[PDB]
Design a protein around this nucleic acid. Structure first.
Ligand SMILES: [Zn+2]
Lengths: 52, 71, 87, 38, 87, 119
RNA sequence: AAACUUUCAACAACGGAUCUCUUGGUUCUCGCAUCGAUGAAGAACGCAGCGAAAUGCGAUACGUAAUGUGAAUUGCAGAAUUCCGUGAAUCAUCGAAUCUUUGAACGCACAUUGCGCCCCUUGGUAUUCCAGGGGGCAUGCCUGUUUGAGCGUCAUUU
RNA sequence: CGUGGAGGUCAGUGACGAAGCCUAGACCGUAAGGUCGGGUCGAACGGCCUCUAGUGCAGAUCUUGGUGGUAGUAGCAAAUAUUCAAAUGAGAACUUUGAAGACUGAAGUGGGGAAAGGUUCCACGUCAACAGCAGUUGGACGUGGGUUAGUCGAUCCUAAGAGAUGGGGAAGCUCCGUUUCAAAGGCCUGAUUUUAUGCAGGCCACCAUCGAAAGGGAAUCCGGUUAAGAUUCCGGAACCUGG
RNA sequence: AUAUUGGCGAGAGACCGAUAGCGAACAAGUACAGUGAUGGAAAGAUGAAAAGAACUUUGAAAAGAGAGUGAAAAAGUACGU
């Protein structure tokens, strides 16, 4: 699916905070919040070059 | 409730949430052939409605309770 | 004093329960629900909010009536009754 | 002078064989419906 | 139960004056008199005429409100209206 | 156990009303007894009997209204067919089939012909 | 020399990788056309002998009727089919009904389970009082009925 | 050289044990790797010729999950303060009762409400988790019980404010305005003396509705009663409103 | 004749195989967070069959040790490997 791993609200935390700059899930109250997203190396992210 | 039945001549019923005191008094009179002096009502926290129905001196709530069949 | 000392003053309500959608999004002073848009006749929905549409769309509830229409169509919206033809 | 910097649309004809079958079925159905006319 | 108004029940509701009855029936006075004679509607007298007529002592004709309500159903009234249209 | 619809349909309205009252009295007594006896399954059979009696009564009354209205132009909306809103708004067969006099004359004079290619 | 620190094997932990599964996903193809004032989608509250969810259902409440099949349901307490049958079943089908409070939501209000009006009927010491039951009372627009308004136009001496 | 899947083939391996994993054991290859024995295990899997790709990791302050050292270390030093005996209990510094010692010291560590919370209230049973020691205790867990009004509130009124209708804008979702440039609705009399079964004569002016449990406002007190109710129940004695 | 990531009903694949594949193989748009608009998880596998360990003994008890069921407890609901 061209939406798989892509329907997340995530942003990078920026530089200088001693963490990898990968976009991370916003919000709170669940384990998902703060987790890396969108990246082919992230669990639950997009695959590299998704099949068409 | 049974202490009320024995001592205060009061019958305790669970009634419909939509029923008012007029309907409660009329229904009790029709169903049990007794005179009703007063009806006090409350809504229990579980969402149901409880009625205290005080009968007149002519009738014995204990006898009516035995006739209904709970004692 | 924007943390705990002010948090000591959290007792009022901006939003109560909405009659139409039940989401506790009814703004008391604006008299409008920020989720479904009640009391506007139409339901509030936005194409930028695809996930929200998916949350509230048809089929997420009981479909008390709409779920029998396919069977009625398949039988051709017949009237009458089935006869006891045999056994 | 100037390049096409945006993303195209794609139409793929996976249904080529299915549509050939469908056209053949429709022609047979119409032949039966209007027989013996051409 | 809030306080009830003081001229709405009892004699005030039991009796209706002739002009009020004619207006309620939406007919003329001649039609009203004809209908009352045909149906046996007769004027009555409240025991408390001031209570029936808002403290007024002026001589008035009173009818039973239920009798006027019953008169409202007579098909002869529909016949009267048909005659008016024919005329 | 329970009541049977093919046996209820024989009774008159008065008999059905009496049996409904008897069933409701029985259900009230059984609800009293359930407070004491930890398990009482007759409650379900009595409830379903009440439902069946009410169903049969409603069938009789609706059928009486239908026979009262038979052939009338205007029927009660609950006696009218449900279908679909759009299906009820569609033209009837008659209205959809109406043609003009000119088109009817043309259709009579020059219908589509049945032919073939052989000779 | 013990203790301790470090290295390997065995057994035991910790943890849940690997492998093997899969009533799920995903993509392609084909066919069909069917929501709602006859009150929809959605929301709330309920309903089972023992049930908080899901599924079902609406005070006729895991359902009533009808039709088919033909002996189950099952986790326990339970229906017995007169066993040679208008008959079980959390079965299938589904054409007859029921469908609480709401919602475009429609007597008026609404964050109230708040406040009215009309009609019929019934019951209470009842011509006057009270209560219950049933049925109604939104807006725009169309056709038609009926009742009207305006020296707006006109007629009105055998 | 290795991996997932595809076509062909070896009439390939296999519950008499496939795959995987462990191994102080063995062999082949310069190597990527390959093969064999032993253990563990339980249902599938390989060699070769070809096809195909989401095909090989030490890093990316990489993602997700798991786990160490630090370390039984830092810390549990505010709230002056506890102690003796008995009961209960497998078990008592912490539960219960008694006895002592203290404290809050009426601007209370006392007794009530608004709001908020939602059963925390009461009883019985109970200690796996929680109350940062403990626990036989508990706002914990299991199971039941409990909230009674003509007079207390809401409900009624209007406040700041909000806001339809009539109109007018706006492509439109809707906007302006709160009484206007609206036919905005009630009431009295009649034999209106002839036209014979068709309502006549008069009177009066103003625009919804919402918005206060601290403003305005009809009317209830005392005594008693429960495990938990109370100006509401019981007894007695009153009052208000309408008819 | 054309379109169709919605709805209903079907058939398929050199696709993924539980950190993959839809966020969701499981009571998933759930639990939960936020005043609100919104944001949004984790979590599959005993065995052919519960045959889910009667009974004895130690312990206050949880449990232990025997005994037993099972092809196997080197399968004991902390369950395939
Ligand atoms: Zn809403």
């Amino acid at each position: 699916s061209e939406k798989a791993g892509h329907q997340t609200s995530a942003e990078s935390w920026g530089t200088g905070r001693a963490v990898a700059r990968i976009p991370r899930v916003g919000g709170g109250g669940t384990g998902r919040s703060g987790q890396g997203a969108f990246g082919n190396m992230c669990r639950g992210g997009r695959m590299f070059a998704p099949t068409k | 409730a049974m202490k009320k039945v024995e001592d205060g001549n009061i019958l305790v019923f669970q009634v419909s949430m939509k029923a008012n005191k007029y309907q409660i008094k009329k229904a009790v009179k029709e169903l049990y052939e007794v005179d009703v002096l007063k009806v006090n009502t409350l809504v229990r926290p579980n969402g149901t409605k409880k009625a205290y129905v005080r009968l007149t001196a002519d009738y014995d709530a204990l006898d009516i309770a035995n006739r209904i069949g709970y004692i | 004093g924007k943390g705990t000392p002010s948090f000591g003053k959290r007792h009022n309500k901006s939003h109560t329960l909405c009659n139409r959608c039940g989401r506790r999004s009814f703004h008391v002073q604006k008299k409008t629900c920020s989720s479904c848009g009640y009391p506007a006749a139409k339901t509030r929905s936005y194409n930028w909010g695809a996930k929200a549409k998916r949350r509230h769309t048809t089929g997420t509830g009981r479909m008390r009536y709409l779920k029998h229409v396919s069977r009625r169509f398949k039988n051709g919206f017949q009237t009458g009754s089935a006869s006891k033809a045999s056994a | 002078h100037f390049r096409k910097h945006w993303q195209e649309r794609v139409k793929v004809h996976f249904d080529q064989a299915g549509k050939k079958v469908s056209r053949r079925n429709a022609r047979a159905t119409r032949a039966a419906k209007i027989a013996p006319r051409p | 139960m809030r306080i009830k108004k003081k001229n709405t029940r009892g004699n005030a509701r039991n009796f209706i004056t002739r002009s009020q009855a004619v207006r309620k029936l939406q007919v003329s006075l001649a039609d009203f008199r004809r209908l009352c004679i045909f149906k046996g509607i007769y004027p009555r007298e409240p025991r408390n005429k001031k209570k029936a007529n808002k403290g007024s002592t002026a001589p008035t004709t009173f009818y039973y409100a239920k009798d006027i309500q019953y008169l409202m159903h007579e098909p002869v009234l529909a016949k009267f209206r048909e005659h008016k249209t024919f005329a | 156990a329970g009541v049977k619809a093919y046996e209820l349909r024989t009774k008159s309205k008065e008999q059905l009303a009496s049996q409904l009252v008897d069933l409701k009295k029985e259900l009230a007594e059984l609800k009293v007894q359930k407070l004491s006896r930890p398990s009482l399954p007759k409650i379900k059979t009595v409830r379903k009997s009440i439902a069946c009696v009410l169903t049969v009564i409603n069938e009789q009354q609706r059928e009486a209204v239908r026979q009262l209205y038979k052939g009338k132009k205007y029927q009660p909306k609950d006696l009218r067919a449900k279908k679909t809103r759009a299906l009820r708004r569609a033209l009837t067969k008659f209205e959809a089939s109406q043609v003009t006099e000119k088109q009817r004359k043309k259709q009579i004079a020059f219908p589509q012909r049945k032919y073939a290619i052989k000779a």
